[PDB]
């Protein structure tokens, strides 16, 4: 299964517009993943990284995006914060793994890299595995916005500023979420 085409892409998605790649009808094997040394985070929920290679699933999904160091703890079941609530929501009965690694060498740039963005404003919490990519002006007050930025009328997406010198909590992290779905199995290790 083309794990490398997900982990090794050149740029990643912004969290608000997280990328989903279907993986189907291939052989899994989680050896080069788990037995890699370059992963700051590798947590599994509902399964077990040991006995991962010797099981089957109807379908697997790989969601990828970039967030701040301090936000990686929100890519987990039952978490709250701007990311979990308004950008990427894991379900409470999550069955899968979360992999994160520091990408300061790739996604920071002297002077600031502002290409990566997150949704700061949203009336309601995302549902699990919701992807909201609207850029409608957000009404914080009482007068309508009519798609014009102003007081009480804010663009809902905001840039991270990734500079190489920031502390690791402010540094970019590439995250990949592997979701296992047992609804006729087609992904085995």
């Amino acid at each position, epitope marked *: 299964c083309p794990f490398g085409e997900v982990f090794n892409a050149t740029r990643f998605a912004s969290v608000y517009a997280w990328n989903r790649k279907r993986i189907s009808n291939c052989v899994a094997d989680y050896s080069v993943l788990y037995n890699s040394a370059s992963f700051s985070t590798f947590k599994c929920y509902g399964v077990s990284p040991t006995k991962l290679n010797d099981l089957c699933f109807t379908n697997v999904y790989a969601d990828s995006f970039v967030i701040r160091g*301090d936000e990686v703890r929100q890519i987990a079941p039952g978490q*709250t*914060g*701007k990311i979990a*609530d*308004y950008n990427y929501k894991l379900p409470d009965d999550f069955t899968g793994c979360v992999i994160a690694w520091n990408s300061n060498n790739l996604d920071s740039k002297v002077g600031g890299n502002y290409n990566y963005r997150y949704r*700061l*404003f*949203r*009336k*309601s*919490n995302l549902k699990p595995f919701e992807r909201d990519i609207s850029t409608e002006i*957000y*009404q*914080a*007050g*009482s007068k309508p916005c009519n798609g014009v930025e102003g*007081f*009480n009328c*804010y*663009f809902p997406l*905001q*840039s*991270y*500023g*990734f*500079q190489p*010198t*920031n*502390g690791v*909590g*402010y540094q970019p992290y590439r995250v990949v979420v592997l979701s296992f779905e047992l609804l006729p199995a087609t992904v085995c290790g």
Partner: antibody
Amino acid sequence: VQLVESGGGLIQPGGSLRLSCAASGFIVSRNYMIWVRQAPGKGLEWVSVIYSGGSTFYADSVKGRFTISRDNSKNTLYLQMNSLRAEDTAVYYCARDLEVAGAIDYWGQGTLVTVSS
Amino acid sequence: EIVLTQSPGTLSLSPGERATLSCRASQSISSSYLAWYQQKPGQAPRLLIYGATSRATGTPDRFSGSGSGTDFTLTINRLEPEDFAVYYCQQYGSSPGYTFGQGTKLEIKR
């Protein structure tokens, strides 16, 4: 647009109070809303935040005693304070927060809470 | 725990001089998450600068912000009499999510 605070007063150690913050112009339920407090002669201290989606976070010194909430019909923010100690004496501000889009740009006038016995 | 240490604790200048207030963070932070407030006795804080460099609504041009990483600075060019006040810095990026410095008092020199 304005934030008007009320409900402060004198209360005993261990007692309970509820602060309220009637908004105008701002819609409380669409904003990051915070309480910040200032003890007499000292600095600003962040107490609590409620997210427009309902998430709530609390400073360590008040976790388990204080409860932030809101009423969309009254357009008001509340702070329920239980197990009050002398050190909770302060002026309490509600304020609207815009994070990287503007920091804390509007603050109410403040309400005084004294915990004494 | 992130700590903002402001300096000096007290600045004494006369009107029309240049005021330089510093904020030092105990760890490196992105400049996006730093703000400056003015507070006059009896009143609520007034936001002056957010994102280290961006002027809030109603902040005259003599106020300017700068810095990154661990070090941030508020500059008042040509002090005015209404600028004598307490000045606070605030971070809003790191746990618990809101931290203020201890304050700098800008006072009249004589």
